[PDB]
Design a protein around this ligand. Structure first.
Ligand SMILES: *Cc1c(COP(=O)(O)O)cnc(C)c1O
Ligand SMILES: *Cc1c(COP(=O)(O)O)cnc(C)c1O
Lengths: 401, 401
């Protein structure tokens, strides 16, 4: 019947827009700098070698497809917490942590979000940085929480507005919830330094806030997995009990397999067992049990010395390629005879880059060079390759000189 | 910190409670009739043959791990809609339907539930049969819907309470939501007959109710995929635009891979396009995109004539196995000299069977014969084997004589 007559067509996605437009375009010189996934030097999706190995191993075993437990694969969840906290870490050693398998980063974030909605009696506000990953808004909003914001990115220098963020944090009502990106901020690429994180911790500790870490790029950011979780660790060390979402989408390139986790740092193991129980009660009516393929794969790798050694080599290779590209892009702009400062492009970490380009410059980049990106000036370094970085440098100079 | 000091231990689950207990038992003759997943004549998990074929094909192809669209894998949703509606189905040829991939049946039901909450303006009430799958309550409840019920199962005869149901349904306020199991009712095993379905459909049309079909056993119930979907079809042919949830967990044995779909029948292809945009919007903030493994396999099977042909043979194979055990259970009861009426056991369809045993009888079975089942009298037919059906019939005789 006419049950759905009142349902309107939802707005379009800009990003998707960017991609379709890239598709039509008949310039063979076209570049898609909108891509939100890694790409190798040949502009192709990259399936890691340790992943193909883990896969063949699973195959070789004729494993069943039986339902996994609500909280996920135990070998997987433990390994995840281990990867985040560190092996000789107090939180880990004493087991006061609770880790659940989620549907990649997103579902992990979502589950935590609904956890807070249900049990965090202290507040309803979630502080997100300006700007933050697009999906962050509706996630917390649909879970039924309210959104607020703290200054983070600085448009004048395309770096961190330390002054502005401290000021804002110093003013957040005690017991509020603050969301922090562990590394490789998305979408700017701007991450605080160590001294700056020390400061941020003190104050977060001070005003007694609940820190919610979104760790979607451990290993993939600097190529060092310890280095990448420094901020998260420092926070716990300082006695701050965080909450965290992990995703294996990028670091292991497990994109569509959906492997991730959500962890809660509790006072002790007792309480952790309590928290785990409510987490299961919350998860069951959402999807019952999580998808097994991706967890099995990540598990084998973290838990099998030979594959893990190899994994570390590969992730480092991915970060190295991106870093090189950033590197090459600046050096080519100097070579084109650009007189503007482009250090931010190398100061920035991870897959995304806030170029600082204005909307009119971006329109021109599109129309004249067939370089497709979002109007915010953001670029996905993954779309850059040895074979096109020159051209790209060339076009930037041209729309900016 | 003490953030979670007020979070209490969640209450223990009973099903989990019986297998746990079943595990600790030393009786060599013990049986687990609490299992919610198919088992072979050997009490082992069964990864279908076609499934194994599908996986190596997938492996030979060297496919990537790139994200799937938010709505899922196109060949999987198309294929999935075809199987339910039927190939020369008006509704299917006309394109007036919308199918989205979910995280198995549970995930699909949840997405459905959440869509109803958002856009079904006519009512927040959801009518569940008495009884229904345990997970159905929290599903609708966490979504934000109110729960109601209708009579369905006659405890006096262990069959359908057709009168109580019709009476009850007649009375449901127009435009309310009614949840229906397509076939193989869980947990009773009680399904209406074709004639009773026409009658139910005629009242459902009348009252202008929104029917929500939960289809988690197509092909798995009778062993015939058309027959198992007759009711869903009849309602549509009756001009009833339903909503549906599908699961590939049992019919394909995809359990832990989590493959399923949610479908909405709309007035026309134009209206569907609109309903599809709102589902994507609701989905992104839940888990971004679905898990690829299960869908890949399932699509390949549905899509390759040669594997579909084998799948059919295999699923008949499974339903046949369950029919046989019910038949055997009955006949062995007769021959032990049991005088109770056990016809319900054969009249019932599916992997679950409401035996009519009383808690005190169930208790004897456990302590004395090591037969583990739930106190409500529900037995999972998958846990019965050609080599224990004999032991089962005798024990039931001893506890009921
Ligand atoms: C990629 C990303 C995630 C998680 O993505 P998934 O594919 O769901 O694992 C979470 N947060 C940020 C900031 C991301 O960039
Ligand atoms: C099995 C089942 C489902 C779906 O199970 P999933 O594992 O989530 O696919 C839904 N409804 C009923 C009544 C079932 O028995």
């Amino acid at each position: 019947s006419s049950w759905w007559s009142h349902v309107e067509m939802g707005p379009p996605d800009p990003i998707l827009g960017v991609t379709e437009a890239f598709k039509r375009d008949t310039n063979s010189k076209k570049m898609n700098l909108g891509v939100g996934a890694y790409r190798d030097d040949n502009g192709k999706p990259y399936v890691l070698n340790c992943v193909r190995k883990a896969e063949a191993m699973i195959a070789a075993k004729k494993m069943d497809k039986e339902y996994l437990p609500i909280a996920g694969l135990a070998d997987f969840t433990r390994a995840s917490a281990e990867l985040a906290l560190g092996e000789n870490s107090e939180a880990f050693k004493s087991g006061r942590y609770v880790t659940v398998q989620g549907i990649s980063g997103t579902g992990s974030l979502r589950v935590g979000a609904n956890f807070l909605q249900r049990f965090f009696k202290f507040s309803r506000d979630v502080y997100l940085p300006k700007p933050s990953w697009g999906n962050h808004t509706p996630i917390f909003r649909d879970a039924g929480l309210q959104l607020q914001a703290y200054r983070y990115y600085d448009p004048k220098t395309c770096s961190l507005d330390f002054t502005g963020a401290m000021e804002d944090i110093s003013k957040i009502p005690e017991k509020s919830i603050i969301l922090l990106h562990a590394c490789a901020h998305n979408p700017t690429g701007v991450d605080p330094r160590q001294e700056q994180w020390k400061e941020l911790a003190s104050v977060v500790k001070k005003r007694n806030l609940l820190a919610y870490f979104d760790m979607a790029y451990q290993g993939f950011a600097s190529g060092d997995i310890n280095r990448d979780a420094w901020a998260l660790r420092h926070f716990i060390e300082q006695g701050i009990d965080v909450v965290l979402s992990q995703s294996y989408a990028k670091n292991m390139g497990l994109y569509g397999e959906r492997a991730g986790a959500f962890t809660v740092i509790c006072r002790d193991a007792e309480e952790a067992k309590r928290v785990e129980s409510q987490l299961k009660i919350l998860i069951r009516p959402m999807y019952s049990n999580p998808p097994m393929n991706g967890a099995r794969i990540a598990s084998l790798i973290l838990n099998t010395p030979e594959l893990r050694k190899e994994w570390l080599v590969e992730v480092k290779g991915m970060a190295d390629r991106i870093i090189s590209m950033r590197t090459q892009l600046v050096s080519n702009l100097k070579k084109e005879g650009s007189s503007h400062n482009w250090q931010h492009i190398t100061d920035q970490i991870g897959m995304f880059c806030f170029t600082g380009l204005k909307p009119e410059q971006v329109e021109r980049l599109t129309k004249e060079f067939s370089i497709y990106m979002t109007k915010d000036g953001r670029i996905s370094v993954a779309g850059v390759a040895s074979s096109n970085v020159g051209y790209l440098a060339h076009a930037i100079h041209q729309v900016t000189k």
